Symmetry: C4
Subunit: 219 residues, 4 copies
Amino acid sequence: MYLRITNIVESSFFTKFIIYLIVLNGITMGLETSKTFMQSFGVYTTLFNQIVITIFTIEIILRIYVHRISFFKDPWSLFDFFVVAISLVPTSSGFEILRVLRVLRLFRLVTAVPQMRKIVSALISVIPGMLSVIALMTLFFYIFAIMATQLFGERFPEWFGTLGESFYTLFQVMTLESWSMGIVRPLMEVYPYAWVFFIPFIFVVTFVMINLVVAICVD
Amino acid sequence: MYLRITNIVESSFFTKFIIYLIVLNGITMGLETSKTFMQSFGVYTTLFNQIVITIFTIEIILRIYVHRISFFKDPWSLFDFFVVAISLVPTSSGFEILRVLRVLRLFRLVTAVPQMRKIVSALISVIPGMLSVIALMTLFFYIFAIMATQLFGERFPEWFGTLGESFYTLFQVMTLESWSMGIVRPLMEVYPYAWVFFIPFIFVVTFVMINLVVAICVD
Amino acid sequence: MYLRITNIVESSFFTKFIIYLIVLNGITMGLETSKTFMQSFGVYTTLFNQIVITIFTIEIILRIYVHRISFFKDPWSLFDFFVVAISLVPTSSGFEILRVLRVLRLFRLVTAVPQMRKIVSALISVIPGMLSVIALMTLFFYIFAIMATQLFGERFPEWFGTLGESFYTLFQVMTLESWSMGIVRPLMEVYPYAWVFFIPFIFVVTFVMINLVVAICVD
Amino acid sequence: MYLRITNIVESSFFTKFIIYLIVLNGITMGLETSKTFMQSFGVYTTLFNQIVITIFTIEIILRIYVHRISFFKDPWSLFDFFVVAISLVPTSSGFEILRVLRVLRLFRLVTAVPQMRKIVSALISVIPGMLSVIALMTLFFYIFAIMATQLFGERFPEWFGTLGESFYTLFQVMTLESWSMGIVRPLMEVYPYAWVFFIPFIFVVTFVMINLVVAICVD
């Protein structure tokens, strides 16, 4: 039966059918949003869901037999696996995080469709030639995070009272949002020289990002 | 008589004339802005308009006789057509949107005048070589927008209570405007881990944007 | 005496002497800032000023004889002229704008010093290959400015009540500062669809700027 | 004994060891952050430090015997030296800045480990090819900063009352943070034409930045 199924799986109809449901479940997912819709076509959409997740567990299985090991060696397939799976976990139990993560299946439309793969693949290909800098950067953030926690965490618990808060705050400063009016001016009301810690931080971080762009925009 | 008019339309004078009015009606639109001016040279400006729109329909007509099918197949002429059409719709009836959309006729100056066309043209040419990425992003937004609606729409109606509500908010976060002080810090007061949803969102959406720039910078 | 002076003007000492005063007047200009300093070395700096402006009117004259017409054909010289001049206008009369514009002389350090000229020159050289786009852009701003004035100027006098206010506000939106939390969200409290006017405006304006960078970053 | 130690220092083990401690002291610094951890494994962490600093001076010494002059001529070694020196200064005395600056020893990991060096190196290499522009800008800031101080420092002490006050503010405006709502709109309530000072400032400073990026992107 191998080749029998293998001709179904590898068939055009198959894919087109899968891509069709993606877009359907996709559209249906946006109505599941409407408080109203849920009172009318409420159940219809609920059943349509269990159906789709079924059809997808089938599809994902059939695909495995037809590919065996090569499947759990395919980035794109693994995704579909670890996404249909999350959608399988009981509607109840634990937390509803998983219940929300289900919408992650609409990402399957990147899988099932060529071109999308190209871009995604094209985008991701660059990540490697960035890790050297990213590492540097993280180290930087880590060092300043620590310094900031022990410099302003006392009188500014909210933004620097913790190693992790400082991280968050420094990332904000990196995106340059409300960094002056919201963080550094207030800070300076107690530590006149705080500007000596942030302006430099902004330069380094800014500079690095600028180069990182140059790289990707050349290398 | 064809060639007769075809020598009028196709002439230099003709174009130069149309361009003269554009820049004239243009200067007029900016005065029609002033409350004061409308109390003095008020009507002078009102009639002047009904005149231009006429002269512009005549012109648009003449051009169609001189081009027949070719006219309704030229982007630039089409624009000129639509823009004149709008301006034609009665000052009254329906909503005043149209009444405002009239000022779109000053975009006519991009049409009538070469060079502008070149730049506009040079710009639009890049668009198609982005669509693959623009689609990816849009899918992305749709997915996270749906997630956000069901993750914070209950306690934060204004920013995520609706699917479109969330789209707007997320776009804001993408432009990085007040993203931390304005939206994420406040959100975290109820959902400590919301930073797990937005920081990653910020990275992905930023990365893409950076790449996109590169593409256009190079490709 | 021509060659006599011409050898002084063209002399090394001359320039070095001029560049020396620039830096001196420059340094002295930053102390003229201090409320305190003005009570101590107050007059000293005041006289030192009249002296420098003298020495500079001399220098500027000597330079003219040695160059005649070629002088008022030299961008760099013209500057020095139209800057030493402003500094000549009476400390009183009219308004103190001119009294502040005097600090513009420290710009002479870009003049008197090679290398600086290179960069400046290098920077300015690009402006030309940007005017096509800049023109387009301005037209755009003008069109939207007008539309906005007649769309929100009524209930939002501060930000759109005038053609010029709208300009200012739109530039702000272009820099993306407080555009959402400060302008569009408030706006939407009265005009639910305002987002249909600004998001597009942001895209066009953003896109254009992105290209303009590509150009300068290639052309 | 020279070669003896020269084989210790120059050895693999040696380096790997130093690197092991870096990452160790590093992890320690982040715990020394926690108020809780300091109440439990408190001293364990305190002694651990005084140990590393020792081992690091020994190491820094050994390296100097093995390199003599070459040591105080290598950027990376110099850094390592200075960073250890700081860490050496008594926990007490003077201000606790030093006490915090100690965490700068985690930058040691950029030194000890190759690759990091490469990136850091690759980054710093670009710096010199910017100085001409960096100087221009700095001159610019100085000039406008002086102007702003005497144009708004009286009615706006917090942002322009001082020469350095104005520097900070202007830098803020350059990063474009809250520049309109935060500073210029408020300023305009007293000085209607202040937009004439800032918009141009924004353009010039932006242009430069854009070019600079280009330079580094290409040159």
